[PDB]
Design a protein around this ligand. Structure first.
Ligand SMILES: CC(=O)N[C@@H]1[C@@H](O)[C@H](O[C@@H]2O[C@H](CO)[C@@H](O)[C@H](O)[C@H]2NC(C)=O)[C@@H](CO)O[C@H]1O
Length: 397
């Protein structure tokens, strides 16, 4: 009766859903007669089809998994999102968020991130030992690691691209490595182009990984979770992924290689984006603008419970999810988690889909699956990306 849309649908992320269910009872106990109705929708389905449709028709869920940047800006300007500054003041929470920028439109706040993310390279410390390689810090090191991994029968990069957004993760970072993080805002303001040779350098580097079989071959047939299977079952030396992936990686009778799992920032390439890491405060929950009194009370309770040090610590301890809020203790965690916090000290850039329009993101997904399938060249990809980028920029008016 009060709808709570989330994307925690995989069995592997059961602890994250169980936390949502705990939050849902606590809301119900706080608000008599309240009935919370959790609805899980697969991430890409929720974000790129279901929720955009509901927003256009004006009937979004009351509480919903929401992304900052482009998505929030679109629903704000359509009047769909509850402004959260009165509530944040009531609860004393506003300044326990180090970064709400993706959710701030004209100084006003329309969502709350539940996590801080980084994206980089998970690796198997025991496979690296076997191959007698150190952590690769630059491109030519990476090539050596990948060549030795493959020579020994390991997949260099566990990789699955049936879900198109997965292919864009390492890509994001590759073209930002070569062209700098300012390339992506440049795309939407018309001062940088997808076809520019410094952008293209990162695409060609990605294609080199394809051409050498360092990105897992046959990946177009595999759903996102399959790259995590390959890595956690010890078949791949590395996997480029987000920090949220540890919720599916390192516990119990699934994971051969739990303690020898590590993480490093992607090697430098001698380009304008060296020394940076993909990360930010992008994903959390938004709230319908159409809330009545019980509904608002439920949303306030949800905020009070979810955005607390108790729940932030719980999801860190249980599932490795890095906190979006300021914490008191935060101590005692898996090595891979130290290594991620370590790697997050670098200069940061947000995911490209927080900056570009939906149509551009969708086109990059489809273009990369064609590139992975050998059905488009890098030249064709960037030509098409730039045309769509021009159209999107014009349609912003
Ligand atoms: C709070 C949390 O852990 N959210 C995770 C999401 O961030 C993640 O989705 C992906 O996040 C990237 C970083 O913002 C985006 O660039 C990427 O587009 C996005 N993917 C989709 C399909 O929206 C998902 C992955 O399933 O896990 C969440 O738990």
């Amino acid at each position: 009766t009060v709808s709570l849309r989330h994307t925690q649908v995989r069995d592997d992320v059961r602890l994250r859903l169980k936390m949502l269910e705990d939050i849902a009872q606590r809301m119900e106990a706080a608000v008599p007669g309240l009935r919370v109705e959790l609805e899980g929708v697969e991430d890409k389905v929720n974000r790129f089809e279901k929720l955009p449709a509901e927003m256009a028709a004006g009937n979004p869920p009351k509480i919903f998994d929401l992304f900052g940047g482009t998505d929030t800006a679109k629903y704000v300007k359509a009047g769909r999102l509850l402004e959260l500054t009165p509530i944040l003041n009531e609860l004393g929470l506003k300044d326990k968020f180090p970064n709400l920028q993706e959710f701030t439109v004209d100084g006003k706040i329309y969502g709350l991130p539940t996590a801080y993310f980084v994206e980089g390279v998970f690796y198997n410390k025991q496979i690296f030992k076997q191959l007698n390689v150190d952590v690769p810090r630059r491109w030519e090191d990476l090539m050596d690691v990948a060549a030795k991994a493959k020579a020994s029968g390991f997949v260099p990069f566990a990789f699955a691209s049936s879900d198109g957004w997965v292919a864009n993760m390492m890509l994001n970072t590759l073209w930002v490595r070569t062209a700098g993080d300012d390339s992506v805002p440049g795309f939407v303001r018309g001062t940088r182009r997808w076809t520019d040779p410094d952008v293209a350098d990162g695409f060609k580097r990605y294609d080199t990984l394809l051409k050498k079989g360092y990105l897992q071959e046959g990946s177009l047939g595999q759903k996102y979770a399959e790259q995590q299977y390959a890595f956690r079952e010890g078949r791949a030396a590395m996997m480029f992924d987000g920090s949220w992936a540890s919720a599916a990686l390192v516990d119990a009778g699934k994971t051969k290689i739990a303690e020898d799992i590590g993480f490093f920032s992607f090697p430098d390439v001698g380009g304008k984006g060296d020394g940076m890491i993909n990360g930010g405060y992008s994903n959390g929950y938004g709230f319908s603008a159409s809330l009545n009194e019980r509904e608002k009370k439920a949303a306030v309770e949800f905020i009070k419970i979810m955005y607390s040090e108790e729940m932030q610590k719980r999801q860190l301890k249980e599932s490795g999810i890095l906190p979006a809020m300021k914490l008191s203790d935060l101590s005692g965690v898996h090595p891979v988690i130290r290594e991620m916090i370590q790697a997050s000290e670098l200069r940061q850039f947000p995911a490209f889909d927080s900056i570009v329009q939906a149509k551009v993101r969708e086109t990059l997904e489809m273009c990369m699956q064609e590139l992975i399938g050998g059905r488009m060249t890098v030249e064709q990809v960037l030509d098409k990306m730039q045309k769509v980028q021009e159209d999107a920029n014009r349609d912003m008016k």
